[PDB]
Amino acid sequence: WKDSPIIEANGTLDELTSFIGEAKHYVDEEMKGILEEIQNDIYKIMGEIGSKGKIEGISEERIKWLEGLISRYEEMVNLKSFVLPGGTLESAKLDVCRTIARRAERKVATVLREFGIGKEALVYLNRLSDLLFLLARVIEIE
């Protein structure tokens, strides 16, 4: 039963990358590239969690990468306080991914809590939902 945090976390991360895998077919080339890099990061996070630390996880640089994109897109979005999900068919895909990332953050927080692993992964997922939110808004603007 002690592995539940591990199994639940990876199951949710798997759901996350699979939904991102679907969403990437609804965005432009640049955004698809960003989303595939994120799938790469999730792959690394799952490796660490699934191996209970035996396999290296993500770098701190991956967190800064997200933050850089967040700063960039934040500049393009005016209204961010009162918006309902899915302004467009395409942005709806990103909002769905956004909600899964938030659920993944929670599952990973638990893993860190009981195994001390996923420290960088937790912060990465926190920022990931922020970025997915902005990407959805940008798609609606563009």
Residue 24, token pair as written in the block: 């990437």
How many C-beta neighbours within 10 Å does residue 140 have?
A: 18
**End-to-end distance of the chain based on CA atoms, in angstroms?**
47
| Contacting residue, 29, 75, 79, 84, with its own copies by CB under 8 A | 84
Q: Does 107 interact with its own copies (rule: CB under 8 A)?
A: no
User: Going residue by residue from 9 to 28, which x/- string records binding to Mg ion, judged by CB under 5 A?
Assistant: --------------------
| Contacting residue, 3, 25, 64, 71, with its own copies by CB under 8 A | 25
Contacts 24+ apart (CB under 8 A), 2-6: 2/114, 5/107, 5/110, 5/111, 5/113, 5/114, 5/115, 6/49, 6/50, 6/52, 6/111, 6/115
Closest distance between its own copies and the C-beta of residue 12, in Å? Answer: 8
Q: Residue 73, SS3?
A: helix
Q: Does 51 interact with its own copies (rule: CB under 8 A)?
A: no
Q: Does 130 interact with Mg ion (rule: CB under 5 A)?
A: yes
* 14 assigned binding-site residue: no
Interaxial angle between packed helices 61-74 and 119-141, expressed in degrees from 0 to 180 and rounded to the nearest 10: 20
| Contacting residue, 21, 74, 115, 141, with its own copies by CB under 8 A | 21
Binding-site positions for Mg(2+): 130
Q: Applying CB under 5 A, which residues contact Mg ion?
A: 130
Q: Applying CB under 8 A, which residues contact its own copies?
A: 7-8, 11, 14-15, 17-22, 24-25, 36, 39-40, 43, 84-89, 91-93, 95-96, 98-100, 102-103, 106
